[PDB]
RNA sequence: CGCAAGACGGACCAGAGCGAAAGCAUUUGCCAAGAAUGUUUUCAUUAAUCAAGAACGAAAGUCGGAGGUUCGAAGACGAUCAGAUACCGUCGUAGUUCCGACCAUAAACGAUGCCGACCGGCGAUGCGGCGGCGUUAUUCCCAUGACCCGCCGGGCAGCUUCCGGGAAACCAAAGUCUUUGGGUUCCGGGGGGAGUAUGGUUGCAAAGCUGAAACUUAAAGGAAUUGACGGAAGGGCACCACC
């Protein structure tokens, strides 16, 4: 296409582009409210963690580090933040 | 040439080590083991010129002379181990291979099991000939 | 003459030139 | 060995060095289903009867 | 002039590949360079398979095959008519002939 | 000037009881001629016997090296000396666009029969697979190879030479390896491709006579 | 059937991967290293390209020690031949292998310097990540492998076309070049003489690096075209060919 809307691409286009190659540099990562059945409360873990996130008052281990996004121990649900 | 073998139907086996190189063909019957041999006549034993030691005809004459020697001793059937020159050399069996096997399939020998014992190297020594090969 | 055998003639002739120049020093 | 009789159902085409042997699908007259390809010399057509001195051999198809 | 983009072989990001000996010659040809044929073949052609099944100890003994991988140099492959000079367009056709 | 075949005694070859078809074949040997004895130059002959000739109605691509361990009188009593795949079969399996995975173990039975087994496996192109390749990552190959060896130690160290040969008559070792390794990479053409006898213990005739019934 | 020795790592093995290149393929262990991807980590211009200088550098070769299975420069013979100190064949020395030093060269080639930008399409593939029906395994789920459908980033490639270029062959790089400038290194100036002589320098040597002139010469060369030729491959025709 000779004519494109380089100014205003679709959101589906902008998520099908590398984080650096987007029209404004936006990350793919997010902050997630992880909570374990050990304790009650909510610990704030990073999506692409890369550390073994231990719980409050050393209950257990929540997060196991992997390549990209870190897996969560079965029982530990997560809730993605907005900002 | 007198065994206490049951004579009617129950077969008496040997194994014929058919080694067909490109310049000679060896039809060589042994026992089930291989340790004691029975008959061995080659291509070059029959036809007296060096170029037709490996002819399929010379190998036929051998396997006919093998088979009729093998019926005197009363080894009825033959297991088969076909063999090429092998090692670093050629793995494709010689021209005399099939004609020699057919020759004792036509003679009166029953055919047991056929396999390859072509000495295939896992990983070889250097091969005769140059870097630049066998030129002609 | 093959360029390789032309080169081999020089390396035999350079080799004999050094030979003669050792005899004169 | 029995001296059997076969019959030309169709000529498959001319083979040999100088095309000197008509390659022929022959039909036996003992069983009218058993049929082999055979190389035949001389002029051959459809309908005529062969006299095979053996019923074992077969012509290699071109 | 350059005749083949691949320079008549199949190394791209290697630099070096181990030479094999030709089966007909013994010319040391690079593995990627060599013309290769994996010929699966019966121990008997057509003239003996009729004669051996008749004179078998065993009923329903399928006659086993003979597995040889053939490595060729280019001078052996062309002289034995495995491969063949092709027209400058037809050279590029990498589809094996059926 | 004389026939050597005039003086050949004809002896029977017996298979041990773990096999079905008993009689293997007939082995001509020169009679005791002064010093050298009929039984003497007879008590180390290998017999490359196919499974189909040895067990009734089973696969005919498996062979069994059986050696004459003692000769009582007219019957040569054989004992296990090795197993190998027919090279026709073994060459049929080794083909392109799949990962050939192999493994050997220097492993010893209860009684002092130190064997060397050889496992093989071939990575299976799946039912719905469109990707031609079907290769295992180097770490996938050496978890299979680690499994292959651990299973071949298990079925040999724990039980005697009679009960490992009965595991080689089916694919009882090759199947358990094929089952276990599905969770790593699905390989299908899994056998123990060879078994090599290395160190036999001291000969005990009473031990062999229980293997022959 | 055993036994011994020294090589080599077939098939799987791919226009696949890894490495600065040379190169690198049996198992397992140990050692330190590395790209790529992932990153809402850290420093904040630390960078690019590089005279001099330096590491590595196939094979052959040299030096000393161990070894020498196979192959095999030289050498010996048998053939072939007019000759055949060649091709072919039988032997066989150094070498080929290993340890430790030397050598610094190859058609070391993608005959294509590196860094950065931009300029079409497509289906693959290798690697990491991301997401998405369903089949299968540990079955007993969950998470994981094996497939499957994509997306993204780097990677070796392939096809495709009037991007454009080029003398053309061909090239998405050899393009973005008379509408000529992103940065930088090395290097060419008709063919020979000549990588010669000379001097310097490195090396045990072999030789490596640097490198003329007199003289000679009207071309040498590139790509492509048409014929002719071929001891190249195919397809015909002919009783001045054969059957």
From Swiss-Prot, chain B:
Subcellular location: Cytoplasm; Nucleus, Nucleolus
Basic residues: compositionally biased ranges: 127-136
Keyword Nucleus carried by entry: yes
Site of covalent link Glycyl lysine isopeptide (Lys-Gly) (interchain with G-Cter in SUMO2): 46, 48, 91
Residue numbers of Phosphoserine PTMs: 1, 124
Stated role: Component of the small ribosomal subunit. The ribosome is a large ribonucleoprotein complex responsible for the synthesis of proteins in the cell. Part of the small subunit (SSU) processome, first precursor of the small eukaryotic ribosomal subunit. During the assembly of the SSU processome in the nucleolus, many ribosome biogenesis factors, an RNA chaperone and ribosomal proteins associate with the nascent pre-rRNA and work in concert to generate RNA folding, modifications, rearrangements and cleavage as well as targeted degradation of pre-ribosomal RNA by the RNA exosome.
Family: Belongs to the universal ribosomal protein uS11 family.
Quaternary structure note: Component of the small ribosomal subunit. Part of the small subunit (SSU) processome, composed of more than 70 proteins and the RNA chaperone small nucleolar RNA (snoRNA) U3.
Protein name: Small ribosomal subunit protein uS11
Organism listed in the record: Oryctolagus cuniculus
Swiss-Prot record, chain C:
Pfam families from the UniProt entry: Ribosomal_L41 (PF05162)
Subcellular locations according to the entry: Cytoplasm
Transmembrane segments: none
Positions of the UniProt region annotated as Disordered: 1-25
Keywords, ordered alphabetically: Cytoplasm, Ribonucleoprotein, Ribosomal protein
Cellular component, GO, one term: ribosome
InterPro entries: Ribosomal_eS32
Keyword 4Fe-4S carried by entry: no
Annotated GO biological process: translation
GO MF term set: structural constituent of ribosome
Primary site of residence: cytoplasm
Assembly and interaction partners: Component of the small ribosomal subunit.
Function, as annotated: Component of the small ribosomal subunit. The ribosome is a large ribonucleoprotein complex responsible for the synthesis of proteins in the cell. Interacts with the beta subunit of protein kinase CKII and stimulates phosphorylation of DNA topoisomerase II alpha by CKII.
Similarity comment: family membership: Belongs to the eukaryotic ribosomal protein eS32 family.
Record's protein name: Small ribosomal subunit protein eS32
Protein's organism: Oryctolagus cuniculus (Rabbit)
UniProtKB/Swiss-Prot annotation, chain D:
SUPFAM superfamilies per record: Nucleic acid-binding proteins
Superkingdom per UniProt: Eukaryota
Cellular compartment(s): Cytoplasm, Cytosol; Cytoplasm; Rough endoplasmic reticulum; Nucleus, Nucleolus
Molecular function per GO: structural constituent of ribosome
CDD domains: S1_S28E (cd04457)
Gene Ontology biological-process annotations: cytoplasmic translation; maturation of SSU-rRNA; ribosomal small subunit assembly
Main location per the UniProt record: cytoplasm
Oxidoreductase in keyword set: no
Record Pfam families: Ribosomal_S28e
One GO cellular component, as annotated: small-subunit processome
Record keywords: Acetylation, Cytoplasm, Endoplasmic reticulum, Nucleus, Phosphoprotein, Ribonucleoprotein, Ribosomal protein
Function comment: Component of the small ribosomal subunit. The ribosome is a large ribonucleoprotein complex responsible for the synthesis of proteins in the cell. Part of the small subunit (SSU) processome, first precursor of the small eukaryotic ribosomal subunit. During the assembly of the SSU processome in the nucleolus, many ribosome biogenesis factors, an RNA chaperone and ribosomal proteins associate with the nascent pre-rRNA and work in concert to generate RNA folding, modifications, rearrangements and cleavage as well as targeted degradation of pre-ribosomal RNA by the RNA exosome.
Recorded family membership: Belongs to the eukaryotic ribosomal protein eS28 family.
Oligomer and partners: Component of the 40S small ribosomal subunit. Part of the small subunit (SSU) processome, composed of more than 70 proteins and the RNA chaperone small nucleolar RNA (snoRNA) U3.
Organism: Oryctolagus cuniculus (Rabbit)
UniProtKB/Swiss-Prot annotation, chain F:
Covalent cross-link site, Glycyl lysine isopeptide (Lys-Gly) (interchain with G-Cter in SUMO2): 14
Modified residues (ADP-ribosyltyrosine): 135
GO terms for MF: structural constituent of ribosome
Keyword Ubl conjugation among record annotations: yes
Keywords: Acetylation, ADP-ribosylation, Cytoplasm, Differentiation, Isopeptide bond, Nucleus, Phosphoprotein, Ribonucleoprotein, Ribosomal protein, Ubl conjugation
Residues recorded as bearing N6-acetyllysine in the entry: 14, 36
Taxonomy, superkingdom: Eukaryota
GO biological process: cell differentiation; translation
Keyword Methyltransferase part of the UniProt annotation: no
Compartment list: Cytoplasm; Nucleus; Nucleus, Nucleolus
Cellular component aspect of the GO annotation: cytosolic small ribosomal subunit; nucleolus
Broad class of where this protein is predominantly found: cytoplasm
Post-translational modification: ADP-ribosylated at Tyr-135 by PARP1 in presence of HPF1.
Subunit architecture: Component of the small ribosomal subunit. Mature ribosomes consist of a small (40S) and a large (60S) subunit. The 40S subunit contains about 33 different proteins and 1 molecule of RNA (18S). The 60S subunit contains about 49 different proteins and 3 molecules of RNA (28S, 5.8S and 5S). Identified in a IGF2BP1-dependent mRNP granule complex containing untranslated mRNAs. Binds with high affinity to IPO4. Interacts with DDIT3. Part of the small subunit (SSU) processome, composed of more than 70 proteins and the RNA chaperone small nucleolar RNA (snoRNA) U3.
The family this protein is said to belong to: Belongs to the eukaryotic ribosomal protein eS1 family.
Name this protein carries in UniProt: Small ribosomal subunit protein eS1
Source species: Oryctolagus cuniculus
Residues of the full protein shown: 21 to 233 of 264
């Amino acid at each position: 296409p000779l004519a494109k809307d380089l100014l205003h691409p679709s959101p589906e286009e902008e998520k099908r582009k590398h984080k650096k190659k987007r029209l404004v540099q936006s990350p793919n990562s997010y902050f997630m409210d992880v909570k374990c059945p050990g304790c009650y409360k909510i610990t704030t873990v990073f999506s692409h963690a890369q550390t073994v996130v231990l719980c409050v008052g050393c209950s257990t281990v929540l997060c196991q580090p992997t390549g990209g996004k870190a897996r969560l121990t079965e029982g530990c649900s997560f809730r993605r933040k907005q900002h | 040439s007198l065994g206490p073998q049951v004579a009617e139907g129950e077969n008496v086996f040997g194994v014929c080590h058919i080694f067909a190189s490109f310049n000679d063909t060896f039809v060589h019957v042994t026992d089930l083991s291989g340790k004691e041999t029975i008959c061995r006549v080659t291509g070059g034993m029959k036809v007296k010129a060096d170029r037709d030691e490996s002819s399929p005809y010379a190998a036929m004459l051998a396997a006919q002379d093998v088979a009729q020697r093998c019926k005197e001793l009363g080894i009825t059937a033959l297991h088969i181990k076909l063999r090429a020159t092998g090692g670093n050399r050629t793995k494709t069996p010689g021209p005399g291979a099939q004609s020699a096997l057919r020759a004792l399939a036509r003679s009166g020998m029953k055919i047991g099991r056929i396999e390859d014992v072509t000495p295939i190297p896992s990983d070889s020594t250097r091969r005769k000939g140059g870097r630049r090969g066998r030129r002609l | 003459m093959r360029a390789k055998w032309r080169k081999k003639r020089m390396r035999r002739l350079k080799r004999k030139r050094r030979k003669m120049r050792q005899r004169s020093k | 060995q029995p001296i059997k009789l076969a019959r030309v159902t169709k000529v498959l085409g001319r083979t040999g060095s100088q095309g000197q042997c008509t390659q022929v699908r022959v039909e036996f007259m003992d069983d009218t289903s058993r049929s082999i390809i055979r190389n035949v010399k001389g002029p051959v057509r459809e309908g005529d009867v062969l006299t095979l001195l053996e019923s074992e051999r077969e012509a290699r198809r071109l | 002039t350059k005749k083949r983009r691949n320079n008549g072989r199949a190394k791209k990001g290697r630099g070096h590949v181990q030479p094999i000996r030709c089966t007909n010659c013994a010319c040391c040809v690079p593995k990627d360079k060599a013309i290769k044929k994996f010929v699966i073949r019966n121990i008997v052609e057509a003239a003996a398979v009729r004669d051996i099944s008749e004179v078998s100890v065993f009923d329903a003994y399928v006659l086993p095959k003979l597995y040889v991988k053939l490595h060729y140099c280019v001078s052996c492959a062309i002289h034995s008519k495995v491969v063949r000079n092709r027209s400058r367009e037809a050279r590029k056709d990498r589809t094996p002939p059926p | 000037v004389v026939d050597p075949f005039s003086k050949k005694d004809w002896y029977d070859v017996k298979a041990p009881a773990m096999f079905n078809i008993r009689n293997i074949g007939k082995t001509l040997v020169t009679r005791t001629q002064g010093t050298k004895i009929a039984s003497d130059g007879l008590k180390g002959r290998v017999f490359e016997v196919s499974l189909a000739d040895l067990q009734n109605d089973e696969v005919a691509f498996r062979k069994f090296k059986l050696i004459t361990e003692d000769v009582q009188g007219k019957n040569c009593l054989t004992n296990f000396h090795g197993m190998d795949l027919t090279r026709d079969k073994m060459c049929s399996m080794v083909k392109k666009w799949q990962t050939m995975i192999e493994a050997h173990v220097d492993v010893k039975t209860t009684d002092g029969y130190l064997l060397r087994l050889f496992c093989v496996g071939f990575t299976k192109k799946r039912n719905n697979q469109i990707r031609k390749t079907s290769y295992a990552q180097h770490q996938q190959v050496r978890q299979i190879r680690k499994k292959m060896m651990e299973i071949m130690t298990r079925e040999v160290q724990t039980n005697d030479l009679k009960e490992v040969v009965n595991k080689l008559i089916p694919d009882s070792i090759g199947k358990d390896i094929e089952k276990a390794c599905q969770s790593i990479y699905p390989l299908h053409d899994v056998f123990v491709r060879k078994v090599k006898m290395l160190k036999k213990p001291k000969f005990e005739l009473g031990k062999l006579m229980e293997l022959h019934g």
